[PDB]
C-alpha cells in the first residue's frame, strides 16, 4: 500500500505494515538565520523529540527495540468489554482508539509498574 496505506483497514491487516510507518520519519547544512532558516531549524528540532519521547516510553515500558510485545498486566474488562476476539479484527484502529482514550493514562502508569517495576527487580534476586 504505502505510508499510512492501511489507515482504514483491519487491525490484523494493518498489523503487517509497521515498517513503512516507521521508515518515513526523519536537509541543508550551513543555515542562515533569516526567515525560512528559522523554520527549518524548527523543523529539525520537532522531528527529534516527537521521535524520541515515545522512544523513551518503550524503554520505560521495557519493550525496547521494535517489538509488538505484550505485557504481564491483565486487561481490565471494565474498559468496554466488547467481544475482544471479534472486534479486534473488525472495525479499524481509528474508531477503536478514541473508545480506549478515556483510560489510556490509567494504563500507562500501570505498565511501568507491572513488569517494569516488579519483574525488573527479580532477575537481580536470582543473580546470586
Partner 1 sequence: NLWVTVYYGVPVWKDAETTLFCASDAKAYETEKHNVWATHECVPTDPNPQEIHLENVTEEFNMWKNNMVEQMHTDIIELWDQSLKPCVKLTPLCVTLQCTNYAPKLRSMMRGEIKNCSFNMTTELRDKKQKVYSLFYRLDVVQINNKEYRLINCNTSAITQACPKVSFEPIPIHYCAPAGFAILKCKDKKFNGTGPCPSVSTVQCTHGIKPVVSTQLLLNGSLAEEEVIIRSENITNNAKNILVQLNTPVQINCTRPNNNTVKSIRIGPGQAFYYFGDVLGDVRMAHCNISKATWNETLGKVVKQLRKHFGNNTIIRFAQSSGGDLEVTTHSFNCGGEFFYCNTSGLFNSTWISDSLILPCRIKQIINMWQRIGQAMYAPPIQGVIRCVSNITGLILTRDSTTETFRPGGGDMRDNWRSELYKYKVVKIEPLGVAPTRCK
Ligand X SMILES: *[C@@H]1O[C@H](CO)[C@@H](O)[C@H](O)[C@H]1NC(C)=O
65 binds a copy of itself (CB under 8 A): yes
Binding site for ligand X (CB under 6 A): 76, 78
| Min CB(17)–ligand X separation in Å | 23
What angle, rounded to 10 degrees, do the helices at 104-113 and 36-60 form?
A: 60
Question: Which residues touch 87 (CB under 8 Å, ≥6 apart)?
Answer: 96
| Min CB(4)–a copy of itself separation in Å | 17
29 binds partner 1 (CB under 8 A): yes
How far apart CA 12 and CA 44 sit, in angstroms, is: 34
How far apart CA 31 and CA 64 sit, in angstroms, is: 35
67 binds a copy of itself (CB under 8 A): yes
| Min CB(118)–partner 1 separation in Å | 14
Residue 24's alpha-carbon distances to 17, 32, 86, in angstroms, are 12, 27, 32
Q: Which is nearer to a copy of itself, 23 or 98 (CB)?
A: 23
Handedness of CA 7, 10, 11, 15 (dihedral sign): negative
Residues near a copy of itself, by CB under 8 A: 15-16, 19, 22-23, 25-27, 29, 31, 33, 38, 41-42, 44-49, 51-53, 56, 59-60, 62, 64-68, 70, 112-113, 116-117, 120-121, 124, 127
Amino acid at each position: 500500500l504505502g505510508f499510512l496505506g492501511a489507515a482504514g483497514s483491519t487491525m490484523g491487516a494493518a498489523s503487517m505494515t509497521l515498517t513503512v510507518q516507521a521508515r518515513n520519519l526523519l536537509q541543508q547544512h550551513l543555515l542562515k538565520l533569516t526567515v525560512w532558516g528559522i523554520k527549518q531549524l524548527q523543523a529539525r528540532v520537532l522531528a527529534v523529540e516527537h521521535y524520541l519521547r515515545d522512544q523513551q516510553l518503550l524503554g520505560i515500558w521495557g519493550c525496547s527495540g521494535k517489538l509488538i510485545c505484550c505485557t504481564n498486566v491483565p486487561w481490565n474488562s471494565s474498559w468496554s468489554n466488547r467481544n475482544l476476539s471479534e472486534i479486534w479484527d473488525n472495525m479499524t484502529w481509528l474508531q477503536w482508539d478514541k473508545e480506549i482514550s478515556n483510560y489510556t493514562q490509567i494504563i500507562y502508569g500501570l505498565l511501568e509498574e507491572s513488569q517494569n517495576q516488579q519483574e525488573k527487580n527479580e532477575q537481580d534476586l536470582l543473580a546470586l
